[PDB]
Curated annotation (Swiss-Prot):
The keyword Cell inner membrane does not apply. This is Endothiapepsin. The gene is EAPA. Belongs to the peptidase A1 family. Its EC number is 3.4.23.22. Disulfide bonds join C255-C290. It catalyses: Hydrolysis of proteins with specificity similar to that of pepsin A, prefers hydrophobic residues at P1 and P1', but does not cleave 14-Ala-|-Leu-15 in the B chain of insulin or Z-Glu-Tyr. Clots milk. The lineage of its organism: Eukaryota, Fungi, Dikarya, Ascomycota, Pezizomycotina. The active site is at D35, S199.
Length: 330
């Protein structure tokens, strides 16, 4: 089998992407944030504290003839931005782009933190990291991809995120019309539960490539590109007036600037992030200070190849017995 679904930016900055997902019988369609950095499929629901729902579409398990309470199971998750959610668990039928999994764990939120409530466009998350990170207790549950894998034509999914435009998540096949050149594959460590890999270096604008190993994760659920302080300083030093602001929480730059590109290495191959992809707009409405799309990882503990990086590429998440990642230009 295969599936193919369009993913759409939630706003004019590409802060995140939503993909429609059918849950239950009859289908209830929710728009979920596909997140290769986590491993829980959780939804706003009829169980979510009413004051914490503000415009999201909810899953109502009592209206699904295929929903079953997973007795005793609870979940609770916290994300790198400090947001969080928790609740109980149902199994139900879940379909993405025509690919159907029966018995998928659908984690129903009883509580969500303020940032989720405040984002009316995201009805939940669909995790695509390794199932060892799933938070369901006392019986850990599998991701949608892990459950679908055996049925897929090939044990892969691909992320083709757009810049200020829709893109595509495909399951079970590699669309050879969706990228240019060849796909360069690179080794993955699953030891931390992430799609963790090592970039071979970077360049800033038209500058020379610096060969240096950068371990990090391919994370569709993180907006920005978080890299070591040395690399980020080298980038922003090429932008007149750019500075790190403790009050804002990162590097800012004059909105009048034209930003240089940023290149990252994948083996001997190179992915170029255009300068425009690094502009996240005014720090507050009407400001002439703009927020940068490349930020230091120094306070995180891991480097994160988030959407800023991934949307410059066609990305293969290869879930073969030994997983690997593939990157192509597009």
């Amino acid at each position: 089998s295969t599936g193919s679904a369009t993913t759409t930016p939630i706003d004019s900055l590409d802060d995140a992407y939503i993909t429609p997902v059918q849950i239950g019988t009859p289908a209830q369609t929710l728009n979920l944030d596909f997140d290769t950095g986590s491993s829980d499929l959780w939804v706003f629901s009829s169980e979510t504290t009413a004051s914490e729902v503000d415009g999201q579409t909810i899953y109502t398990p009592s209206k699904s003839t295929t929903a079953k309470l997973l007795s005793g199971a609870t979940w609770s998750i916290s994300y790198g931005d400090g947001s969080s959610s928790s609740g109980d668990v149902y199994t139900d039928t879940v379909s993405v782009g025509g690919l159907t999994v029966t018995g998928q764990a659908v984690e129903s939120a009883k509580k969500v933190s303020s940032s989720f409530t405040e984002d009316s466009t995201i009805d939940g998350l669909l995790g695509l990291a390794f199932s060892t990170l799933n938070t369901v207790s006392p019986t850990q549950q599998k991701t949608f991809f892990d459950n679908a894998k055996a049925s897929l034509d090939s044990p892969v999914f691909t992320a083709d995120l757009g810049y200020h435009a829709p893109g595509t998540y495909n399951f079970g096949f590699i669309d050879t019309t969706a990228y240019t050149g060849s796909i360069t594959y690179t080794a993955v460590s699953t030891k931390q539960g992430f799609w963790e890999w090592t970039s071979t270096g970077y360049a800033v604008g038209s500058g020379t490539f610096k060969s240096t190993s950068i371990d990090g994760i391919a994370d569709t659920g993180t907006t920005l590109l978080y890299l070591p302080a040395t690399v980020v300083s080298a980038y922003w030093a090429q932008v007149s007036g750019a500075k790190s602001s403790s009050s804002v929480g990162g590097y800012v730059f004059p909105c009048s600037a034209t930003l240089p590109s940023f290149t990252f290495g994948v083996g001997s191959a190179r992915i170029v992030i255009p300068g425009d992809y690094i502009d996240f707009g005014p720090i507050s409405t009407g400001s002439s200070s703009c927020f940068g799309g490349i930020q230091s990882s120094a306070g995180i503990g891991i480097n994160i190849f988030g959407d800023v990086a991934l949307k410059a590429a066609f990305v293969v998440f290869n879930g073969a017995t030994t997983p690997t990642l593939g990157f192509a230009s597009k």
